Amino acid sequence: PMNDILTWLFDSHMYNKRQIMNNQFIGDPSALVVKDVESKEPGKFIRLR
Amino acid sequence: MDKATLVKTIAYRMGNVKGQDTAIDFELALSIERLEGQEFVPWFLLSENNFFEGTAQENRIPVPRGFIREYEEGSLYLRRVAGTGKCLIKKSQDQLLKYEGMTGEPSHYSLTNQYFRIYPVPQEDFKVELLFYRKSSTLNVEDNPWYEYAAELLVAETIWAMLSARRDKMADYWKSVAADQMRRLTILDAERRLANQEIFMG
Amino acid sequence: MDKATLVKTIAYRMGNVKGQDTAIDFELALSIERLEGQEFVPWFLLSENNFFEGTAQENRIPVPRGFIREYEEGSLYLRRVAGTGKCLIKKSQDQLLKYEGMTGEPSHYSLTNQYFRIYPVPQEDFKVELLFYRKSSTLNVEDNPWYEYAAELLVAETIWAMLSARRDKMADYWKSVAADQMRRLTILDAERRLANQEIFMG
Amino acid sequence: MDKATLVKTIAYRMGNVKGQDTAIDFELALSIERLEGQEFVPWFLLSENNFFEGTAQENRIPVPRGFIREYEEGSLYLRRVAGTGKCLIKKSQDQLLKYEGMTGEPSHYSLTNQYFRIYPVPQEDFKVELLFYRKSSTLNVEDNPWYEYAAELLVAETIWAMLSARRDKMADYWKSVAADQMRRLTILDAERRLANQEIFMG
Amino acid sequence: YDWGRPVKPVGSDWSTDTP
Amino acid sequence: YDWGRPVKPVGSDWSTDTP
C-alpha cells in the first residue's frame, strides 16, 4: 500500500506536467504581419505595437 | 448590380428624380475613381501576375500602368532560362549605393518615384514578374468588381455628391452611411486574409 | 417566411400601404443582397460540401462561384483515387514560393486574389474537396434561407430603407431597431457555434 | 485629370456655375501652388536624378532650381571620371569649418542658405550627382502630376477658396473636407514608402 | 547652374498572363 | 470551373416518445 501511494503521487505529477507545460502565445492576428512572426533569425522587427 | 439598378436606386432614394440620368452617370464614374484614390484598398484589386521584360545595361524599370502599391506578401521574382529563380530584396536607395559598379544577377530593388531600380546591373536581357494592386480600369476583368462588391458603398457616396451640389441638409446622412459601409468593408478584408492560416512562433 | 406575409407586414407597419408592393419587392430584394455584402456571415449561409477536379500542370485554380470566405475550422482537403485523403496547409504566397519546382503530392495553397495556387504541382489530373460560405442567390437548396430565420432584420431594413427614402425622421429609429436585431443575431451565432462543445487543453 | 472634367466638376458642385470658368482657372492654379508651399511633400512630387559640374577653386555651389528639400534616404554623391563614386556626408557649417585648407577629394557639405559649400576644395573641374523634391512647375515630365493623383484635394481646396471668397458659411465645411483628404493622403504616403520593406537590426 | 536632367528612353510596356 | 454539388438523398424523418 505504501508503495502504491508512491505510484499515484509520482504519476499524478508527471501527468499534469505533460498536459500543460508548453510555451505558447496569445495575440490578435489582425494587426501583426504573419509572415514575420513565424521566422527565426537573430534580429527581426515584427511590425506594429 | 448591373450599373443600371444603381442609377434607378439613386433616383428612387433621392426622391424619384427623373431627368438627371446623364448627371447620375457622370457622377457615379467620378466616384469610383475617388474611392480608388483613397488610402485604404479593398481585396479585389490585385492584378493577375504581370511580368515586364527588361533590356540590358539599364537599371531603372518603368512602373506598371496605373500602379497603386505592391503586395505585402509578394515580391519581384526573376525567372531564368531554366525556369527557376530567386526572390529579390528591397532596401532604401541609400543602403543600395554600395553595389554600384558591380557584376552579377540582380539582387536589390528600390522604389524611387516612378522607377524601380536595379543596382546589380544585369548585363543581359532579363525579366521579372510582380503582384501589385492596380487601378480598376486597367484590370482586364470583363466588368468592374466594385459594381459587384459593396455596391451599397457606391450608391451612398454618389448620392452624397449630388446632394452636396444641391445644398441640402441630408448630405451628411449619406456621408455617414458611406462610412459605416467603408469600415465594414475593411473588416471583411481583414477577416478574409487570415481565415484559415495557422501561425507558429517559428 | 412565405414572402407574402413579409410584404403585408411591411405594408401594415409603415402606415397601411396599398400600392407600393412593386417598390416593396424591388427594394426588399435589394436588402438581402446588402446584408450579405456586410462583414457578417450568419450560420444559415453556410454552403454544403463541394468538390472540384483540376488538370495537370495547371497550378492555378479559380475561385468557386459565389464564394465569400472559407469555413474557419474547415480546410482544403485533397482526395486521392485510393480513397485516402489529406488536408492541405495555408500560407502566404511569400512563404510558399520556395517549393517552386518540387513535384509530388500537393501540400499548400494561398488565397491570392481570385485563384487558388498549389506549388507542389502534380503531373496528372486531380480532385479537390472544399467548403465555404456562399450567397443565397447561389445555393442549391430550394428556399431562400434568409426569409426563414431572421425575418425581422429583413423587415426592418427594407423599411428603414423605404422610410429613409422619403426623408422621414423615424429613419433613425428604424435603423436603431435593425442594429439591435443585428447584435441579437450576432449573439445567437455564437450561441450555436459553441453550443455544447467540451474543451480541455490538449 | 484632363483639367476639363475638374473644371466642370467644380462648376457643378458649388451650385451649377456657368461663367466663372476664368476665375475658376485663375484660382485653381493658385491652389496647386499653395499646396506645394505647404509643409507636406507627396511622393509624386519627387524629381528624377540630377547631375551638375562645378569648376575649380569654387567651393560655392548654388542651389538647384525649384528645389525644396532633399530626399531623406538619399544623399549627395560624388562621381569621378574613372566611373568610381562616393557619397558625401552632411554636417553643420560649424562642425565642418575645420577642413578649411585640406586639399583632395570632396567629402562633406552644408545646406547653408542658398548655396552648397564643399570645404575639401578640388583644384580642377568636377561633376556631382543630386536628388531632391521639385515643384511641378519645374519638372521635365509632360503632364502635371497633381491632377492625376489627388484630384479631390485640388477640387476641394479651390472650391473652399472660391466659396470662402463670397463670404459663405459652407466654407468651414469644405475646409474640413480638404483637411480630411490631406490626412488621408498623408497616410497613403507612408502606405507606399514602407510598403513591403523588410527590416532587421543590423 | 548647369544641372542637366538625364532622359529616360527605355521602352515601357507590360504584359498579362492568360487564365 | 467544375465544382459539382453532391446531393443529399437520405430520408429525413424523426419521431416522438409517447408519455
Interface of D with E (CB under 8 A): 48-53, 62, 64-65, 130, 140
Question: D153 with D185: CB under 8 angstroms?
Answer: yes
What does the alpha-carbon distance between residue C159 and residue C23 come to, in Å, rounded to a whole number? 11
What does the alpha-carbon distance between residue B26 and residue B22 come to, in Å, rounded to a whole number? 6
Closest CA to C116 of C168, C50, C47, C194: C50
Residue D187, all three cell numbers: 497616410
What does the alpha-carbon distance between residue D91 and residue D117 come to, in Å, rounded to a whole number? 11
Interchain contact, E10 vs B140, CB within 8 Å: no
What does the alpha-carbon distance between residue C52 and residue F4 come to, in Å, rounded to a whole number? 7
Q: What is the DSSP letter of B64?
A: P
- Secondary structure class of D145 (helix, strand, coil): helix
Tell which B residues from 117 to 156 touch D, by Cβ distance under 8 Å: none
Closest CA to D45 of D148, D197, D161: D148
**Residues on chain C touching F10 (C-beta within 8 angstroms):** none
Q: Which amino acid is at D76?
A: L
Please say whether the dihedral angle defined by the alpha carbons of residues D74, D78, D82 and D84, taken in this order, is positive or negative.
Answer: negative
Question: B43 with B189: CB under 8 angstroms?
Answer: yes
Q: Which residues is D160 bridged to in the sheet?
A: none
Quote the Cα angle for B133-D153-B21, to 5°.
80
What does the alpha-carbon distance between residue C180 and residue C183 come to, in Å, rounded to a whole number? 5
**Residues on chain E touching C112 (C-beta within 8 angstroms):** none
Residue A4, all three cell numbers: 502504491
Task: Give Dmax over CA atoms of chain D in angstroms.
Answer: 68
What does the alpha-carbon distance between residue C17 and residue C10 come to, in Å, rounded to a whole number? 8
What does the alpha-carbon distance between residue C74 and residue B195 come to, in Å, rounded to a whole number? 10
**Residues on chain B touching D80 (C-beta within 8 angstroms):** none
Closest CA to D198 of B95, B61, A29: B95
Question: D184 with D76: CB under 8 angstroms?
Answer: no
What contacts B149, CB < 8 A, 6 or more positions away? B42, B44, C37
Question: Does D11 reach chain B within 8 Å, measured CB to CB?
Answer: no
Which residue among B48, B64, B65 places its CB closest to the CB of E17? B48
Best of F1, F2, F3 to disrupt the C interface (most C CBs within 10 Å) is: F3
Question: D99 with D120: CB under 8 angstroms?
Answer: yes
Question: Quick one: closest CA in E to B56, which residue?
Answer: E10
Interchain contact, B113 vs D43, CB within 8 Å: yes
Per the entry, the structure determination technique was cryo-EM
Q: State the CB neighbour count (10 A cutoff) for residue A6.
A: 10
Q: Quick one: which H or E segment has residue C34?
A: helix C21-37
Interchain contact, D191 vs B34, CB within 8 Å: no
Q: For the stretch B170-190, what's the b/e string if a residue is b when 16 or more beta carbons lie within 10 angstroms of its beta carbon?
A: ebebbbebbeebbebbeebee
Question: Does C202 reach chain A within 8 Å, measured CB to CB?
Answer: yes
Q: List, as one string, the DSSP characters of D165-198.
A: HTT-TTHHHHHHHHHHHHHHHHHHHHHHHTSS--
Please say whether the dihedral angle defined by the alpha carbons of residues C116, C118, C124 and C129, taken in this order, is positive or negative.
Answer: negative
Virtual torsion, Cα C25, C27, C30, C35, nearest 10 deg: -110
- Secondary structure class of B191 (helix, strand, coil): helix
Question: B41 with B68: CB under 8 angstroms?
Answer: yes
Residue B127, all three cell numbers: 525579366
Best of C90, C93, C111, C201 to disrupt the A interface (most A CBs within 10 Å) is: C201
Question: E18 with D58: CB under 8 angstroms?
Answer: no
Residue D141, all three cell numbers: 515630365
B-C Cβ pairs (cutoff 8 Å, strict): 73
What does the alpha-carbon distance between residue C135 and residue C3 come to, in Å, rounded to a whole number? 18
Q: For the stretch C95-107, what's the b/e string if a residue is b when 16 or more beta carbons lie within 10 angstroms of its beta carbon?
A: bbbeebeeeeebb
Interchain contact, C90 vs B197, CB within 8 Å: yes
Closest CA to B15 of B145, B130, B174: B174
Helix/strand/coil percentages in chain B, nearest 5: 35, 20, 45
Q: Which amino acid is at B151?
A: A
Residue D159: phi and psi, rounded to 5, are -65, -50
What does the alpha-carbon distance between residue D65 and residue C76 come to, in Å, rounded to a whole number? 60
Question: D98 with D107: CB under 8 angstroms?
Answer: no
* Distance between B1 CA and the closest CA of chain D, angstroms: 26
Task: Give Dmax over CA atoms of chain F in angstroms.
Answer: 54
Interchain contact, E16 vs B50, CB within 8 Å: yes
**Residues on chain C touching F4 (C-beta within 8 angstroms):** 50-52
What contacts B92, CB < 8 A, 6 or more positions away? B110, D73, D197
| Residue that has been written with the C-alpha cell 553595389 in this structure | B99
Best of B51, B113, B125, B141 to disrupt the E interface (most E CBs within 10 Å) is: B51
Best of F2, F5, F7, F10 to disrupt the C interface (most C CBs within 10 Å) is: F5
Interchain contact, D49 vs E4, CB within 8 Å: no
Decide the pairing of beta strands C60-62 and C115-117.
antiparallel
Nominal resolution (angstroms): 6.7
Q: Which amino acid is at D56?
A: A
Q: Which residues is C86 bridged to in the sheet?
A: C78
Distance from the Cα of residue B41 to its chain's centroid? 6
What does the alpha-carbon distance between residue C15 and residue D108 come to, in Å, rounded to a whole number? 81
Closest CA to C109 of C133, C83, C82, C78: C78
Distance from the Cα of residue C126 to its chain's centroid? 26
Closest CA to B16 of C167, D169, C121, D43: C167
Q: What is the DSSP letter of B99?
A: G
Question: Does B201 reach chain A within 8 Å, measured CB to CB?
Answer: yes
C5-13 vs C151-165: helix crossing angle, rounded to 10: 40
Q: Quick one: which H or E segment has residue C73?
A: none
Residues in chain D, overall count: 202
**Residues on chain C touching A20 (C-beta within 8 angstroms):** 201-202
Residue B1, all three cell numbers: 448590380
- Secondary structure class of B67 (helix, strand, coil): strand
Closest CA to D62 of D6, D137, D127, D112: D112
Decide the pairing of beta strands C89-90 and C108-109.
parallel
Q: List, as one string, the DSSP characters of D45-111.
A: GBPPPEEEEE-TT--EEEPPTTEEEE-TT---EEE-TTS-EEE-EE--HHHHTTTTT--SS--EEB-
What does the alpha-carbon distance between residue B92 and residue B115 come to, in Å, rounded to a whole number? 13
Residue D14, all three cell numbers: 458649388
Q: Which amino acid is at E10?
A: V
CA count, 13 A, side-chain hemisphere, B138: 18
